[PDB]
Design a binder for this molecule. Structure first.
Ligand code: HEM
Ligand code: HEM
Lengths: 153, 153
Protein backbone atom coordinates (compact mmCIF):
# COMPACT_ATOMS: atom_id res chain seq x y z
CA UNK A 1 0.00 0.00 0.00
CA UNK A 2 0.93 3.64 -0.29
CA UNK A 3 1.28 5.99 2.58
CA UNK A 4 -0.73 9.21 2.83
CA UNK A 5 2.12 11.26 1.43
CA UNK A 6 2.70 8.81 -1.47
CA UNK A 7 -0.95 9.20 -2.51
CA UNK A 8 -0.58 12.97 -2.38
CA UNK A 9 2.49 12.73 -4.65
CA UNK A 10 0.52 10.56 -7.13
CA UNK A 11 -2.26 13.21 -7.19
CA UNK A 12 0.27 16.05 -7.63
CA UNK A 13 1.99 14.42 -10.60
CA UNK A 14 -1.42 13.59 -12.18
CA UNK A 15 -2.23 17.35 -12.04
CA UNK A 16 0.85 17.83 -14.22
CA UNK A 17 -0.30 15.07 -16.61
CA UNK A 18 -3.64 16.82 -16.93
CA UNK A 19 -2.05 20.15 -17.82
CA UNK A 20 -0.94 18.49 -21.11
CA UNK A 21 -2.90 15.32 -21.33
CA UNK A 22 -2.66 15.02 -25.13
CA UNK A 23 1.16 15.23 -25.16
CA UNK A 24 1.48 12.82 -22.24
CA UNK A 25 -0.95 10.33 -23.70
CA UNK A 26 0.67 10.38 -27.12
CA UNK A 27 4.13 9.82 -25.57
CA UNK A 28 2.93 6.99 -23.37
CA UNK A 29 1.48 5.05 -26.28
CA UNK A 30 4.46 5.60 -28.50
CA UNK A 31 6.70 4.44 -25.67
CA UNK A 32 4.59 1.28 -25.21
CA UNK A 33 4.38 0.54 -28.96
CA UNK A 34 8.11 1.12 -29.69
CA UNK A 35 9.36 -0.62 -26.57
CA UNK A 36 6.92 -3.52 -26.78
CA UNK A 37 5.79 -3.82 -30.44
CA UNK A 38 3.70 -6.92 -29.71
CA UNK A 39 1.22 -4.69 -27.87
CA UNK A 40 0.47 -2.66 -30.98
CA UNK A 41 -1.25 -5.75 -32.48
CA UNK A 42 -4.19 -5.35 -30.04
CA UNK A 43 -5.09 -2.08 -31.80
CA UNK A 44 -6.85 -2.64 -35.09
CA UNK A 45 -6.85 1.11 -35.62
CA UNK A 46 -3.15 1.64 -34.98
CA UNK A 47 -1.20 -1.44 -36.04
CA UNK A 48 -0.56 -0.04 -39.55
CA UNK A 49 1.70 2.63 -38.02
CA UNK A 50 5.28 1.40 -38.52
CA UNK A 51 7.41 4.34 -37.33
CA UNK A 52 7.50 6.74 -34.39
CA UNK A 53 6.95 9.65 -36.76
CA UNK A 54 3.85 7.94 -38.19
CA UNK A 55 2.59 7.39 -34.65
CA UNK A 56 3.16 11.06 -33.75
CA UNK A 57 1.18 12.21 -36.83
CA UNK A 58 -1.95 10.22 -35.84
CA UNK A 59 -4.72 12.39 -34.28
CA UNK A 60 -6.52 9.12 -33.43
CA UNK A 61 -3.55 7.62 -31.50
CA UNK A 62 -3.26 10.97 -29.64
CA UNK A 63 -7.00 10.86 -28.87
CA UNK A 64 -6.76 7.30 -27.49
CA UNK A 65 -3.82 8.27 -25.29
CA UNK A 66 -5.98 11.00 -23.73
CA UNK A 67 -8.80 8.48 -23.13
CA UNK A 68 -6.40 6.07 -21.38
CA UNK A 69 -4.79 8.71 -19.14
CA UNK A 70 -8.21 10.21 -18.27
CA UNK A 71 -9.54 6.80 -17.27
CA UNK A 72 -6.45 5.91 -15.23
CA UNK A 73 -6.41 9.33 -13.55
CA UNK A 74 -9.98 8.94 -12.48
CA UNK A 75 -9.37 5.48 -10.98
CA UNK A 76 -6.25 6.68 -9.14
CA UNK A 77 -8.10 9.63 -7.65
CA UNK A 78 -10.96 7.40 -6.48
CA UNK A 79 -8.50 4.92 -4.97
CA UNK A 80 -6.69 7.70 -3.16
CA UNK A 81 -10.00 8.99 -1.77
CA UNK A 82 -11.00 5.54 -0.45
CA UNK A 83 -7.53 4.97 1.01
CA UNK A 84 -7.58 8.33 2.80
CA UNK A 85 -10.67 7.16 4.77
CA UNK A 86 -9.74 3.47 5.17
CA UNK A 87 -6.10 3.93 6.16
CA UNK A 88 -6.69 6.13 9.32
CA UNK A 89 -9.33 3.63 10.53
CA UNK A 90 -7.12 0.55 9.97
CA UNK A 91 -4.25 2.44 11.64
CA UNK A 92 -6.14 3.25 14.83
CA UNK A 93 -7.94 -0.12 15.07
CA UNK A 94 -4.70 -2.10 14.61
CA UNK A 95 -2.35 -0.16 16.77
CA UNK A 96 -4.39 1.74 19.39
CA UNK A 97 -7.64 -0.19 19.90
CA UNK A 98 -6.32 -3.61 18.78
CA UNK A 99 -9.52 -4.86 17.25
CA UNK A 100 -9.54 -8.41 15.78
CA UNK A 101 -11.17 -8.94 12.37
CA UNK A 102 -13.69 -11.23 14.08
CA UNK A 103 -14.97 -8.35 16.14
CA UNK A 104 -15.49 -6.38 12.88
CA UNK A 105 -17.54 -9.38 11.74
CA UNK A 106 -19.62 -9.20 14.91
CA UNK A 107 -20.37 -5.52 14.33
CA UNK A 108 -21.19 -6.21 10.68
CA UNK A 109 -23.75 -8.80 11.79
CA UNK A 110 -25.23 -6.22 14.19
CA UNK A 111 -25.46 -3.64 11.36
CA UNK A 112 -27.22 -6.10 9.07
CA UNK A 113 -29.64 -7.02 11.87
CA UNK A 114 -30.43 -3.39 12.74
CA UNK A 115 -30.99 -2.52 9.03
CA UNK A 116 -33.32 -5.48 8.63
CA UNK A 117 -35.18 -4.71 11.88
CA UNK A 118 -35.64 -0.99 11.12
CA UNK A 119 -36.17 -1.12 7.32
CA UNK A 120 -37.71 -4.54 6.38
CA UNK A 121 -39.35 -3.20 3.22
CA UNK A 122 -36.03 -1.73 1.91
CA UNK A 123 -33.91 -4.63 3.05
CA UNK A 124 -35.17 -7.79 1.37
CA UNK A 125 -32.98 -10.82 0.57
CA UNK A 126 -31.14 -9.20 -2.35
CA UNK A 127 -30.45 -5.94 -0.49
CA UNK A 128 -29.29 -7.95 2.51
CA UNK A 129 -26.98 -10.13 0.42
CA UNK A 130 -25.47 -6.99 -1.16
CA UNK A 131 -24.84 -5.40 2.24
CA UNK A 132 -23.33 -8.63 3.60
CA UNK A 133 -20.88 -8.65 0.69
CA UNK A 134 -20.12 -4.92 1.10
CA UNK A 135 -19.24 -5.38 4.77
CA UNK A 136 -17.13 -8.46 4.05
CA UNK A 137 -15.32 -6.43 1.35
CA UNK A 138 -14.74 -3.70 3.99
CA UNK A 139 -13.32 -6.28 6.46
CA UNK A 140 -11.09 -7.68 3.74
CA UNK A 141 -9.78 -4.18 2.98
CA UNK A 142 -9.02 -3.66 6.76
CA UNK A 143 -7.39 -7.08 6.95
CA UNK A 144 -5.05 -6.15 4.03
CA UNK A 145 -4.05 -2.98 5.95
CA UNK A 146 -3.58 -4.93 9.23
CA UNK A 147 -1.19 -7.27 7.29
CA UNK A 148 0.89 -4.33 5.97
CA UNK A 149 1.13 -3.13 9.62
CA UNK A 150 2.11 -6.61 10.84
CA UNK A 151 -1.00 -6.72 13.12
CA UNK A 152 -2.41 -10.27 12.99
CA UNK A 153 -5.94 -9.50 14.13
CA UNK B 1 -16.55 -8.42 -5.49
CA UNK B 2 -19.97 -6.84 -5.85
CA UNK B 3 -21.75 -6.13 -9.08
CA UNK B 4 -22.78 -2.57 -10.00
CA UNK B 5 -26.40 -3.41 -9.07
CA UNK B 6 -25.29 -4.73 -5.67
CA UNK B 7 -23.32 -1.53 -4.96
CA UNK B 8 -26.40 0.46 -5.85
CA UNK B 9 -28.53 -1.52 -3.39
CA UNK B 10 -25.96 -0.86 -0.64
CA UNK B 11 -25.98 2.88 -1.24
CA UNK B 12 -29.78 2.89 -1.43
CA UNK B 13 -30.17 1.35 2.04
CA UNK B 14 -27.42 3.54 3.52
CA UNK B 15 -29.59 6.52 2.64
CA UNK B 16 -32.01 5.23 5.28
CA UNK B 17 -29.28 5.13 7.98
CA UNK B 18 -28.31 8.74 7.33
CA UNK B 19 -31.81 9.96 8.23
CA UNK B 20 -31.25 8.85 11.86
CA UNK B 21 -27.58 7.98 12.16
CA UNK B 22 -27.40 8.30 15.93
CA UNK B 23 -30.39 6.00 16.60
CA UNK B 24 -29.00 3.39 14.20
CA UNK B 25 -25.56 3.70 15.84
CA UNK B 26 -26.92 3.27 19.37
CA UNK B 27 -28.85 0.16 18.37
CA UNK B 28 -25.87 -1.34 16.53
CA UNK B 29 -23.56 -0.87 19.50
CA UNK B 30 -25.99 -2.20 22.09
CA UNK B 31 -26.66 -5.23 19.80
CA UNK B 32 -22.92 -5.82 19.52
CA UNK B 33 -22.20 -5.43 23.22
CA UNK B 34 -25.08 -7.58 24.39
CA UNK B 35 -24.42 -10.40 21.88
CA UNK B 36 -20.62 -10.39 22.28
CA UNK B 37 -19.62 -8.97 25.70
CA UNK B 38 -15.94 -9.34 25.01
CA UNK B 39 -16.30 -6.47 22.46
CA UNK B 40 -17.45 -4.12 25.23
CA UNK B 41 -14.21 -4.83 27.09
CA UNK B 42 -12.27 -3.06 24.30
CA UNK B 43 -13.93 0.22 25.23
CA UNK B 44 -12.23 1.75 28.23
CA UNK B 45 -14.89 4.45 28.20
CA UNK B 46 -17.95 2.19 28.11
CA UNK B 47 -16.97 -1.15 29.69
CA UNK B 48 -18.45 -0.17 33.08
CA UNK B 49 -21.96 -0.17 31.53
CA UNK B 50 -24.01 -3.11 32.80
CA UNK B 51 -27.67 -2.63 31.78
CA UNK B 52 -29.52 -1.64 28.61
CA UNK B 53 -30.91 1.42 30.45
CA UNK B 54 -27.35 2.49 31.35
CA UNK B 55 -26.31 1.98 27.71
CA UNK B 56 -29.27 3.99 26.39
CA UNK B 57 -28.54 6.68 29.06
CA UNK B 58 -24.92 7.13 27.85
CA UNK B 59 -24.39 10.42 25.95
CA UNK B 60 -21.02 9.22 24.72
CA UNK B 61 -22.16 5.76 23.51
CA UNK B 62 -24.76 7.42 21.32
CA UNK B 63 -22.18 9.93 20.00
CA UNK B 64 -19.78 7.05 19.29
CA UNK B 65 -22.47 5.11 17.33
CA UNK B 66 -22.87 8.13 15.05
CA UNK B 67 -19.09 8.36 14.60
CA UNK B 68 -18.88 4.73 13.60
CA UNK B 69 -21.73 4.72 11.10
CA UNK B 70 -20.62 8.02 9.61
CA UNK B 71 -17.13 6.66 9.05
CA UNK B 72 -18.41 3.33 7.57
CA UNK B 73 -20.80 5.09 5.22
CA UNK B 74 -18.04 7.31 3.89
CA UNK B 75 -15.80 4.28 3.25
CA UNK B 76 -18.60 2.36 1.55
CA UNK B 77 -19.46 5.32 -0.70
CA UNK B 78 -15.81 5.83 -1.66
CA UNK B 79 -15.36 2.12 -2.36
CA UNK B 80 -18.44 2.09 -4.57
CA UNK B 81 -17.17 5.14 -6.44
CA UNK B 82 -13.85 3.48 -7.16
CA UNK B 83 -15.52 0.25 -8.26
CA UNK B 84 -17.87 2.16 -10.62
CA UNK B 85 -14.78 3.36 -12.56
CA UNK B 86 -12.61 0.24 -12.31
CA UNK B 87 -15.19 -2.44 -13.02
CA UNK B 88 -16.15 -1.27 -16.59
CA UNK B 89 -12.45 -1.06 -17.48
CA UNK B 90 -11.65 -4.56 -16.17
CA UNK B 91 -14.73 -5.95 -17.95
CA UNK B 92 -13.78 -4.54 -21.35
CA UNK B 93 -10.09 -5.40 -21.00
CA UNK B 94 -10.91 -9.00 -19.91
CA UNK B 95 -13.69 -9.84 -22.32
CA UNK B 96 -13.34 -7.70 -25.42
CA UNK B 97 -9.69 -6.56 -25.68
CA UNK B 98 -8.23 -9.57 -23.76
CA UNK B 99 -5.27 -7.73 -22.24
CA UNK B 100 -2.82 -9.75 -20.09
CA UNK B 101 -1.60 -8.34 -16.80
CA UNK B 102 1.91 -8.27 -18.31
CA UNK B 103 0.76 -5.78 -20.96
CA UNK B 104 -0.64 -3.65 -18.14
CA UNK B 105 2.86 -3.89 -16.61
CA UNK B 106 4.36 -2.65 -19.89
CA UNK B 107 2.04 0.37 -20.00
CA UNK B 108 2.71 1.10 -16.34
CA UNK B 109 6.39 1.19 -17.09
CA UNK B 110 5.80 3.44 -20.11
CA UNK B 111 3.88 5.90 -17.90
CA UNK B 112 6.68 6.01 -15.33
CA UNK B 113 9.19 6.40 -18.16
CA UNK B 114 7.30 9.33 -19.73
CA UNK B 115 6.67 11.06 -16.40
CA UNK B 116 10.37 10.81 -15.59
CA UNK B 117 11.16 12.16 -19.06
CA UNK B 118 8.76 15.19 -19.24
CA UNK B 119 9.21 16.46 -15.64
CA UNK B 120 13.05 16.30 -15.21
CA UNK B 121 12.87 18.58 -12.15
CA UNK B 122 10.02 16.96 -10.30
CA UNK B 123 9.56 13.23 -10.49
CA UNK B 124 12.30 12.00 -8.18
CA UNK B 125 12.88 8.61 -6.64
CA UNK B 126 10.22 8.92 -3.92
CA UNK B 127 7.47 10.17 -6.27
CA UNK B 128 8.47 7.50 -8.82
CA UNK B 129 8.22 4.86 -6.09
CA UNK B 130 4.75 6.18 -5.15
CA UNK B 131 3.59 5.91 -8.75
CA UNK B 132 5.14 2.45 -9.20
CA UNK B 133 3.18 1.26 -6.15
CA UNK B 134 0.00 3.05 -7.33
CA UNK B 135 0.21 1.37 -10.71
CA UNK B 136 0.92 -2.03 -9.15
CA UNK B 137 -2.06 -1.37 -6.81
CA UNK B 138 -4.09 -0.63 -9.96
CA UNK B 139 -2.87 -3.79 -11.75
CA UNK B 140 -3.70 -5.76 -8.61
CA UNK B 141 -7.20 -4.21 -8.54
CA UNK B 142 -7.67 -5.26 -12.25
CA UNK B 143 -6.27 -8.72 -11.55
CA UNK B 144 -8.82 -9.25 -8.75
CA UNK B 145 -11.60 -8.27 -11.22
CA UNK B 146 -10.14 -10.55 -13.90
CA UNK B 147 -10.43 -13.47 -11.43
CA UNK B 148 -14.10 -12.67 -10.67
CA UNK B 149 -14.85 -12.59 -14.42
CA UNK B 150 -13.09 -15.89 -14.99
CA UNK B 151 -10.54 -14.32 -17.31
CA UNK B 152 -7.01 -15.60 -16.82
CA UNK B 153 -5.02 -12.37 -17.06
C1 HEM C 1 -3.41 2.05 -17.76
C2 HEM C 1 -3.93 1.04 -18.48
C3 HEM C 1 -5.10 1.17 -19.35
C4 HEM C 1 -6.16 1.98 -19.31
C5 HEM C 1 -6.52 3.02 -18.26
C6 HEM C 1 -6.90 1.82 -20.46
C7 HEM C 1 -8.09 2.45 -20.81
C8 HEM C 1 -8.92 2.28 -21.90
C9 HEM C 1 -10.14 2.92 -22.20
C10 HEM C 1 -10.75 3.95 -21.23
C11 HEM C 1 -10.64 2.43 -23.35
C12 HEM C 1 -11.90 2.79 -24.09
C13 HEM C 1 -13.14 2.09 -23.31
C14 HEM C 1 -12.93 0.63 -23.08
O1 HEM C 1 -12.97 -0.10 -24.12
O2 HEM C 1 -12.78 0.17 -21.95
C15 HEM C 1 -9.66 1.46 -23.78
C16 HEM C 1 -9.66 0.66 -24.99
C17 HEM C 1 -8.71 -0.23 -25.45
N1 HEM C 1 -7.69 -0.67 -24.71
FE1 HEM C 1 -7.08 0.03 -22.97
N2 HEM C 1 -6.33 0.82 -21.24
C18 HEM C 1 -5.25 0.45 -20.59
C19 HEM C 1 -4.29 -0.50 -21.02
C20 HEM C 1 -4.36 -1.17 -22.24
C21 HEM C 1 -3.29 -1.97 -22.80
C22 HEM C 1 -1.93 -2.17 -22.19
C23 HEM C 1 -3.79 -2.48 -23.99
C24 HEM C 1 -3.06 -3.31 -25.02
C25 HEM C 1 -1.77 -3.70 -25.05
C26 HEM C 1 -5.11 -2.02 -24.17
C27 HEM C 1 -5.92 -2.23 -25.22
C28 HEM C 1 -7.12 -1.60 -25.61
C29 HEM C 1 -7.82 -1.73 -26.78
C30 HEM C 1 -7.42 -2.68 -27.91
C31 HEM C 1 -8.87 -0.89 -26.74
C32 HEM C 1 -9.96 -0.62 -27.74
C33 HEM C 1 -9.35 0.39 -28.73
C34 HEM C 1 -10.29 0.85 -29.85
O3 HEM C 1 -10.39 0.16 -30.86
O4 HEM C 1 -10.95 1.91 -29.81
N3 HEM C 1 -5.39 -1.14 -23.12
N4 HEM C 1 -8.58 1.32 -22.89
C1 HEM D 1 -17.79 -0.91 11.06
C2 HEM D 1 -16.69 -1.05 11.83
C3 HEM D 1 -16.06 0.06 12.59
C4 HEM D 1 -15.97 1.37 12.26
C5 HEM D 1 -16.40 2.02 10.94
C6 HEM D 1 -15.32 2.03 13.34
C7 HEM D 1 -15.00 3.42 13.35
C8 HEM D 1 -14.41 4.09 14.46
C9 HEM D 1 -14.26 5.52 14.50
C10 HEM D 1 -14.53 6.38 13.31
C11 HEM D 1 -13.63 5.80 15.70
C12 HEM D 1 -13.15 7.16 16.22
C13 HEM D 1 -11.81 7.41 15.45
C14 HEM D 1 -10.70 6.37 15.58
O1 HEM D 1 -10.21 6.13 16.67
O2 HEM D 1 -10.28 5.65 14.60
C15 HEM D 1 -13.43 4.60 16.41
C16 HEM D 1 -12.90 4.40 17.69
C17 HEM D 1 -12.93 3.17 18.41
N1 HEM D 1 -13.30 1.92 17.89
FE1 HEM D 1 -14.08 1.54 16.14
N2 HEM D 1 -15.04 1.16 14.37
C18 HEM D 1 -15.48 -0.07 13.91
C19 HEM D 1 -15.46 -1.25 14.67
C20 HEM D 1 -14.97 -1.46 15.98
C21 HEM D 1 -15.11 -2.57 16.79
C22 HEM D 1 -15.75 -3.85 16.32
C23 HEM D 1 -14.51 -2.26 18.00
C24 HEM D 1 -14.41 -3.12 19.20
C25 HEM D 1 -15.03 -4.25 19.51
C26 HEM D 1 -14.07 -0.96 17.88
C27 HEM D 1 -13.42 -0.37 18.99
C28 HEM D 1 -13.11 1.05 18.97
C29 HEM D 1 -12.52 1.78 20.12
C30 HEM D 1 -12.23 1.20 21.46
C31 HEM D 1 -12.44 3.03 19.80
C32 HEM D 1 -11.96 4.17 20.74
C33 HEM D 1 -13.28 4.72 21.31
C34 HEM D 1 -13.20 5.86 22.32
O3 HEM D 1 -12.82 5.62 23.45
O4 HEM D 1 -13.67 6.99 22.00
N3 HEM D 1 -14.34 -0.44 16.66
N4 HEM D 1 -13.95 3.53 15.67
Amino acid sequence: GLSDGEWQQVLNVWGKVEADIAGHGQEVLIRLFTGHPETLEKFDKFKHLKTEAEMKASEDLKKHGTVVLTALGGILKKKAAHEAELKPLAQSHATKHKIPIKYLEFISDAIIHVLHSKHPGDFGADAQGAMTKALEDFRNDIAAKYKELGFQG
